[PDB]
Design a protein around this ligand. Structure first.
Ligand SMILES: Nc1ncnc2c1ncn2[C@@H]1O[C@H](COP(=O)(O)O)[C@@H](O)[C@H]1O
Lengths: 113, 115
């Protein structure tokens, strides 16, 4: 699903530390973790960035957050966590395939970058 | 009671003012009074969900709507160089208002890690 490294992960062409999968998304740990728990939830649909998401993608985007919530509980994050979507250059977006970050296991600080 | 018992409930019921960017029957977007970036606003559901960790499976479309409204508002506010969306959950997330909400920050380079 796409011409990025996240497409290769979805297609199982390269290994990843997969947490959860269903028919429309994939959750895996970030290869460059910024917290004791740091994982990504990505749609299998190649949406390059949140700014081009369509109105019909609404439930899919919410699905990423519900999956992230459920994964966080099953990774032991009962003291809280932070969810992040980066858009474009100012947002620090690293891969042009929409992805939800979930970070926890330490105190997250303010501002969020 | 509609909108909950937090400060965001008072905003939803229009009891206290806020600089509103967008409103529909499901959500409200308004500027943050303690901005951490040149543009910093919030998108919140009108339904009172205290935190993302207790959202129900049926809340999925509503949560996605917050993100769609967030990116449309970001475009309307001129954030063509990008932005960051954030949800804070619980103590480790730094949550202070226990009513689900999405931060949208832009107008400067955001740094990594995100706090
Ligand atoms: N009356 C208000 N109007 C606008 N923003 C607010 C108001 N009260 C709190 N906030 C913001 O809501 C956020 C709550 O923190 P958190 O729950 O950690 O996201 C902070 O960014 C506050 O500055």
């Amino acid at each position: 699903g796409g011409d990025t490294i996240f497409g290769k992960i979805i297609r199982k062409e390269i290994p990843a530390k997969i947490i959860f999968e269903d028919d429309r998304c994939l959750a895996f740990h970030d290869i460059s973790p910024q917290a004791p728990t740091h994982f990504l939830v990505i749609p299998k649909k190649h949406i390059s960035q949140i700014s081009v998401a369509e109105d019909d993608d609404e439930s899919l985007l919410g699905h990423l957050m519900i999956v992230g919530k459920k994964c966080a509980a099953d990774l032991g994050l009962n003291k809280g966590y932070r969810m992040v979507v980066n858009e474009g250059s100012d947002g620090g977006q690293s891969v042009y395939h929409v992805h939800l970050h979930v970070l926890g296991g330490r105190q997250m600080h303010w501002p969020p970058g």
